[model samples]
Target: SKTGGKISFYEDRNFQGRRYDCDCDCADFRSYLSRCNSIRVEGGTWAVYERPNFSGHMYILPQGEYPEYQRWMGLNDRLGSCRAVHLSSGGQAKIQVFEKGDFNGQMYETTEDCPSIMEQFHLREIHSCKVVEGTWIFYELPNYRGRQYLLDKKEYRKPVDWGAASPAIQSFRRIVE
Candidate 1:
């Protein structure tokens, strides 16, 4: 239903070698997976950690296919742990994004989560944004494939304000616990 998550990790790039399926938080993957070369996310969003017990170099992987760890700009071949990204509320998500700082310029608001900002809003750059409801994750590229940033119910006037290395955001999605 809407309360569960699933994912599979592979030991070789392009989804080759040994594989392991996961549905709950894993403190350590060394027990089953030799290395995380690829991943397939399903059901819900997930956060992968570089160190055990959900620590170090975290990367958000929503429902999709990651043929390689480098698809997320990952710097290593090791993955220690993983867990779903859950929201405390049981309601629809809403958000507002702008092309200029301080919520100025072109604006797009949505109650339903968007998978591709460019496909939905036809925008290529986002300087500011406001999360009105639910937890959200913004991606650095379209189709939800790239670096991501988790956002709460708050306003970000600039990219750096929200820990984004750049002002170019191409996709976003809501997370549920």
Candidate 2:
């Protein structure tokens, strides 16, 4: 069997109150969860949206225990939907983000966490990515904060292709299960 992923949303802080367990992509959780005050991400990476249909503020929650909604990066208490970030986890742990399409322009490659792309690469935009191994979370801001994009063993030709509205990818880190 594949490595399974599970996430539990709680209505109260400190993992108290009503709980909803989700192991698959959930487009809407209003019926099961009125609000997400805390969470527990198990086994894999996940993308939680503030609004339904995977729209609005997005946060990439790696495997861990979130004691409260405020603990989630970007401060979110209203979680409308969620989806498992399913990228190839069995590849080499390497990723390259390019400044231009077709893998042109300034480039940065690494197998470790990059706290700030601007600080290391001094680039403002990331147009494409080459995921050579494992999975990664691309952050909109530095230090692994703000909006995030999930990538695996694949090639992203453009910013829009990765569901990014902007090219301001400032940080990245590997996803471990």
Candidate 3:
């Protein structure tokens, strides 16, 4: 079973203007608002998308208040869908990153968060990866900033396999309940 978390989307920045409240996964927000500039997550973590039906750039957001789209590392105000992240009660998160595609090149594994993959793995880009234990979020910049990509338990042979346009990944962290 999973919890249907509560979340609120705002049409304007600073939580102003039209608002739409949701307690479950929504594949489309076309009829809800013209744009989404702010968000409030009252319970559980969430995966937000730039396109409808959970396509395009995705961002993982936990319970918090985002006064502006940038606060959530949003590229624009075109938020199209969102869903609660149901984390497993598994022991720990484990992931392996490969320098080249198809799980080739230098491999680095970790069960903890990395604030800067460059400092830790000495690599500027991760071409392939395997999420072995739990869900994780990859950040385009160090210190968990910039574009985000949700990585569930699976193998991503290339950047595009993970919904990324490039291989640039600077940081990552586990998704907790």
Candidate 4:
């Protein structure tokens, strides 16, 4: 169904510079997904309809049901956790794993809104997270310029120093696992 905006499945599963040649939902879906997914991708979730345009790519580590979690600063002075993912319109991603989920499902409180800040050199700083090298890294968003960030909620910190960029006293980032 061309109207449905088809999906192009990847076997290598590597999201490195794989662009569709046209603009469609599958592409948008990929962009929308790289940063958020309540559920893991279907084992064999593959379908095809149309192609995406060149010049736009989404990078992610798709390990079935595996996801990395990270917890940083900023809180209501309470214990809560949530995940933050990204979207295109602001493009390019550099993943940094923060934590691994415990299948026990012990039940924890968390938030889905994470804020970001602008750092030196016009870098969009947000607490970045991802499942990398089988480990999680809870650190401030390294450095990405001119990129639109779609965080969970408000992870931005007031009176933040773009020059200092210290997540110690007041940082605009939150993480969870």
Candidate 5:
């Protein structure tokens, strides 16, 4: 059986000051720390929210060390909630990005990571997307840099549906355990 994931939140940067460890989903973390400037994911993928109950700005991170909130593309040190990402097993991750909204216009499907969507698909923006299998993270800039948007198996008809102000995805990769 799979063990529960582990995640640590630090009140100060670089894991200094107070600390709180969580192994499962938490609707609110306000009681654990007054603020969160750093985080460390010890196991499994996680999605942290800016507001409580998994709402507001979301950042999906895999197992790694984030010495500062900026490392995870967080706008500020206000992590209110978090939950583990349940990934599908066995099959390869698949997704399709469309040039226009509602799955119309040009499209490209991939089962592998794309470092540069423009170079590969000859497109500068992704108006919509469909996650066919597993979970993925879309980056605002190429080479997997900048703001991250987590996409599970579902249809995102437009940019706002995935919590983006614009359809400006430049790169993406699957979330693997």
Candidate 6:
């Protein structure tokens, strides 16, 4: 016999950080981290928005692009070094600086031309990605010119207002002037 009382599907869901030994059996369905790609976004733009979406929030807690902060990309210099595009996971993609390597240096305005306007070849065509011992590892293809960058994800907890990127751009403008 069924009574007319309402039934609650869930109750007492909050465990208050209680550690669980459930392995693949007693886990909440949505406990894994997610990543989004090819979304036209930046720390400066996302930080200033009133309603930062899930994707926006994803980057907010991580320090934004370091090279962009360092080079002031997209600021009058179409050939800036800070404009790297994002690609899907384990995908083949061409990576180039906004400015050619020789744009203002020895590598700039060279006679030779390659896949990218930038003379130097940064990371491109990631061949392998694996999770080794609790770390997500990536292996990239051989590049003509290459360097590595180590950026910590913890610095993204704050907002990247205009001051963070604008001052550098202004300084560059003054240098050109």
Where does model 5 exceed 4 Å of error? 53-56, 67-75
lDDT, candidate 3, at 140: 92
State the local distance difference test value for candidate 4. Answer: 0.24
Estimate TM-scores for all models. Answer: 0.59, 0.87, 0.86, 0.16, 0.86, 0.16
Tens-place lDDT digits, model 1, residues 1-177: 367789999999998999999988888879898788888887787888788876555687768888998875676878889877765575666787887898899887887767777777878788998896646878787777666777778889888886677788888877654
Off by over 4 Å in 3: none
Error of 6 at 57 (Å): 6.8
Clashing pairs in 3: none
- The segments of candidate 1 whose C-alpha lies over 4 angstroms from its true place after superposition are 1-46, 49-57, 61-76, 79-86
Point out the worst 10-residue segment of candidate 6 by lDDT: 168-177
Candidate 2 least-lDDT 10 residues: 87-96
Off by over 4 Å in 6: 1-91, 100-177
Residue range 1-177, candidate 4, lDDT tens digits: 112212222211242223222123232444432332122232222212112331221122222431211111112111111122222223222232112122121222222222332232233322223321221113234332121122232222321321123322111223221
Q: Report per-prediction Cα RMSD to one decimal.
A: 5.1, 2.1, 2.1, 18.2, 2.1, 20.0
Q: Candidate 5: worst 10 consecutive residues by lDDT?
A: 87-96
Score residue 23 of candidate 4 by CA lDDT.
Answer: 26
lDDT of 5 by residue, 1-177 (tens): 567789999999999999999998999879988899999999888999898987777788789999999888789999889988887777667787889999999888888899999899999898888986668789899998877888878899989898788889899988777
- 93-161 per-residue lDDT for model 3 (tens digits): 778889999999989888889999989988989989998754688899999888788887889998888
Question: lDDT of each structure?
Answer: 0.79, 0.82, 0.86, 0.24, 0.87, 0.18
So what's the TM-score on candidate 5?
0.86
